[PDB]
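During the second year of the project, the team shifted from modelling isolated chains to modelling whole assemblies. The rationale, set out in the original proposal, was that interfaces cannot be judged from single-chain predictions alone. As a representative example for this report, we include one of the complexes processed in the last quarter. Its constituent sequences, exactly as entered into the pipeline, are reproduced here:
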Amino acid sequence: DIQMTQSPSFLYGSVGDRVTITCRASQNIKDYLNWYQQRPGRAPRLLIYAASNLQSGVPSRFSGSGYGTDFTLIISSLQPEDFATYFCQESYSSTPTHIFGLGTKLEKKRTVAAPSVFIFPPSDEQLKSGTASVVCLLNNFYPREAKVQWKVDNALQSGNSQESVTEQDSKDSTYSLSSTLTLSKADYEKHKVYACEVTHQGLSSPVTKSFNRGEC
Amino acid sequence: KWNWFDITNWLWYIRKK
Amino acid sequence: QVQLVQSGGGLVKPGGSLTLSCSASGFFFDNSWMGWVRQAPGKGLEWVGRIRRLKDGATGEYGAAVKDRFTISRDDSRNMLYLHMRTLKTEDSGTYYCTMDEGTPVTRFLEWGYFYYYMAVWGRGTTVIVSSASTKGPSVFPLAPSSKSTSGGTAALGCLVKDYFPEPVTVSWNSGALTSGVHTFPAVLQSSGLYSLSSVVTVPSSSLGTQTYICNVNHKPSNTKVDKRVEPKSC
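Output from the structure prediction step:
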């Protein structure tokens, strides 16, 4: 199986910047590699084929290079229409489980901003129905990478939460993230302390927001 | 009908004599 | 310009079948290889397969994840490309793009007979949702502001829009009067097969005593509308 590893997952740039996207193949595929661009709300389009050949109509600021295992897509003068997701694609073989890289999303650059953290207990109306949703909000942070860990009476929770993140804000270029911990009513009423622990580059150490059912 | 695949096939035939 | 008009798709139960259609114009369809690529919600591209010209034998080739269950066919007399799918699974959900494909012969001598292949023109895509869920309107629960949802001189509040199907819901605050500081999150698909999303807003703490906050939720598929007033709670 040929594995394509694309990096970074999120790339941050400003208009006019030169940015570089990399793709590594797990084995030598010579120049059998294509690059695609998926702009917001649009179908993908071909940028580069056979490692370095520009498709007709593609602007000059795009170039590709590489032969063997290491390939690069370079955008020399980033334009607003270039804020998009980019995928590499091996064309050496049709049998691999995944012939595309997982994608690189090109985002707008700004200064680091730590999240503001908020926690919400379940409502009495929901509990009456048999379920308890606890919500942790991380608001207006940058960059996008963030970790949320749930603890209930100091037990680390796993497999019973889901996260969602907004698109980059158009006016301040930040992200927000919601994490929802879902428990049964019975389980919620057998524990006291509910805590969301947040790790982010803007924080010197992880921040915890928590409440106790005795006071909540 | 002539396209890139036809050329590829002719080149295969040449490499194999 | 090359046009690839796509049709079909929609909702189907797991274990069911579907045929997607792609109507091509603006090029010599008969002399073109064609293919399909898909994309699960919020995920990356996955190659579905390709089909050669009739004069090549009309051979279909398929991606690893679909080979047992998918067939590509073409009707040159109508410029139609099809993707026939059976025994569908929830993970087959996503957007399906038809593609007009092209190739370039490799000219390195030892690779004469091989080709560079690429998807040159892509259709807009067709949405497929594979789900056992029945149409259902959401419950709407408050995310009540408290001492544990303050930051500086501000407070966060919101509404949790839970257990609906299918997408989408819309959320406004105060009938559209409140837009600043609102974040409405993308929906998540729960293990139940139902969707959930949250909408939040940050406001001055000074406004909680005097300003009312109501989230207005509309779920057209079930013809359900809810207005939820969100009040502070001690926490």
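Chain B touches chain C through twelve residues (CB under 8 Å). The two ends of chain B are 24 Å apart (CA to CA).
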